[PDB]
Design a protein around this nucleic acid. Structure first.
Ligand code: MG
Ligand code: MG
Ligand code: MG
Ligand code: MG
Lengths: 292, 294
RNA sequence: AGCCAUGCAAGCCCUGAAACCCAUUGCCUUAGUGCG
DNA sequence: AAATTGATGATTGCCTTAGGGGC
DNA sequence: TTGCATCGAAACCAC
DNA sequence: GTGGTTTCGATGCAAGCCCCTAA
DNA sequence: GGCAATCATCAATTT
């Protein structure tokens, strides 16, 4: 039994299509059902995953990009795209609780940075006590991430031992990438992260064009590489020096060779994160420093 | 003694042109010195304001738009702009403490909205405890704004009596506009606020074109009129209904007539705010009479 | 008096061969001046 | 006299793109 | 796909 | 038995652009 | 016109 859902929070908007008729509300969960949606939240879908009722999702751009060629008709388009382009739809899986702690950590940190910048701009005690409370929340949730990482083998067995990696690098890298059966090649992970290349051209933001990578992992990798640089970490600092020397003959100012070296190291680190996680979880393979 | 300063926070970047040579640092404050700058912070200008040293500032776009016709040379360009078009330069004045409380209030409110929206998207004990702390801060600063408004004649003598006006509406309107002596006509305030009309076209944001109005006062005015609409406030609700009815024959949907009526009411309210603030401060009058003002 | 269409923010999503090809962001403050 | 919290040294440059659309 | 922008009045609460 | 704090009702609509640049 | 992105090391502080 396939059902296509045009999701919403407001029950007036919701619609479901069985391929023949339209329904206004969802059933009780059962593993006879496969659900397909254009990005339904885990808030609504977790009851189904919790009983083995599969949920498949596709990008919020998939229908808009089919339309280059009422709302309730869009449930029919979602159903039609599941029939015509079943390669797009990917299985939603229930998250680990680390991803929640890391989310709340970054939700506190942006409030902390936001508050620090105002303390730079002019000084008042109200924001200084707030800054202290927000710093405590950020600290306690870093300690929560630190605690939860004990349940994450790729940290305790590997990322813990790399000099210049600690709880926040690993908390972000884990939760932003997630289950490593989602990426059947290293290049799928680079493409998802924003490190792929077409004809020698990088992925850049461009107004009026939807992006197709999770840019937060490329922003995160920037800080992982920044740490490798400042700590002079093992294999990875050597690779930075080697590339930064190799590339400066080819580019017009030092900062371009720097950005190219950073990109090179971030890509090779993601290759190693892939390799180690695939070997840990028992997925197919196709050097990291500490891993043997 | 005129000095043109290309201001900065880091003293390595600071540059001043005295009309003959480039200097790296400012002199001791004296009313003999007139400073001209492109948006210098109050942090750096306040020592001069307290000693009567006039500080004149111009829009950060004035030089960029003049160039349409070393890096330290910009200190000279400011000097050149002050010499050729001194009308672009306006006297900076030390802000009232109300503006600080309102700024901190809006900083807390935006953190509250941000946190409540996260609570809507996901529920966690961490953010609920935080949401309660942030709400407390917003509440205490609302009381701080409310308390500071006692020192503002335009509040206690006029805006306080209008149904639908309280401490946040009035605090925002006062601090966003600042001194009303900056606008010699109601049309100047409409232009600065974003309500002016050119050959029948309104001011709209536009990629690649620097705006020339303080859009935050137009966003605030939207809430002032929204308050009048929900409360059915006297003169202003009548004006809203009358204009929305007069305009609906000329537009294709109810929402467009609504936006035109809202704009009309906002402009009339700003005209009354201008008039009352001018009379309270003792400035010249010009030109519906305000409701509670006599 | 006519002419006349305020924004801010949150959540989530994204899928090039392991050479070579190869330029991450998120914020903060402040400014802005129609006609008779 | 150990666990927790604080401080601050580690390096690295200085374009444009201002910047994703969508649910 | 969402929630927010404010005040005025009725009710609840503590001391 | 008052001063202060909480909850909630009022009213209006479903474009169009997301759409400021500068110090 | 500004800041932040985090980890490692040495030390100070409370308990
Ligand atoms: Mg939909
Ligand atoms: Mg978040
Ligand atoms: Mg400058
Ligand atoms: Mg602010």
């Amino acid at each position: 039994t396939i059902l296509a859902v045009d999701w919403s929070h407001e029950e007036r908007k919701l619609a479901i299509f069985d391929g023949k008729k339209i329904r206004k509300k969802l059933p009780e969960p059962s593993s006879d059902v496969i659900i397909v949606a254009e990005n339904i939240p885990q808030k609504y879908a977790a009851p189904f995953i919790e009983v083995g009722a599969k949920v498949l999702r596709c990008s919020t751009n998939a229908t808009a990009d089919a339309r280059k060629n009422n709302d309730e008709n869009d449930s029919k388009v979602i159903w039609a795209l599941y029939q015509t382009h079943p390669e797009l739809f990917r299985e939603m899986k229930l998250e680990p609780p680390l991803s929640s702690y890391y989310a709340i950590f970054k939700d506190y940190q942006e409030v902390r940075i936001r508050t620090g910048n105002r303390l730079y701009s002019d000084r008042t005690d109200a924001m200084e006590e707030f800054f202290k409370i927000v710093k405590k929340g950020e600290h306690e949730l870093k300690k929560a991430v630190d605690k939860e990482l004990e349940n994450h083998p790729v940290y305790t067995q590997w990322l813990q031992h790399i000099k210049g990696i600690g709880p926040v690098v690993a908390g972000g890298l884990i939760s932003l990438i997630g289950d490593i059966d989602r990426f059947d090649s290293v290049s799928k992970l680079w493409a998802y992260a924003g490190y792929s290349v077409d004809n020698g051209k990088v992925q850049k933001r461009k107004k009026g064009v939807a992006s197709n990578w999770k840019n937060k992992i490329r922003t995160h990798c920037y800080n992982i590489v920044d740490s490798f640089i400042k700590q002079r970490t093992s294999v990875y600092r050597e690779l930075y020096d080697a590339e930064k020397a190799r590339q400066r003959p080819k580019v017009e100012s030092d900062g371009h060779a720097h950005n190219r070296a950073v990109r090179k190291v971030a890509k090779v680190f993601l290759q190693h994160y892939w390799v180690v996680s695939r070997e840990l979880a028992g997925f197919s393979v196709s050097k990291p420093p500490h891993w043997n």
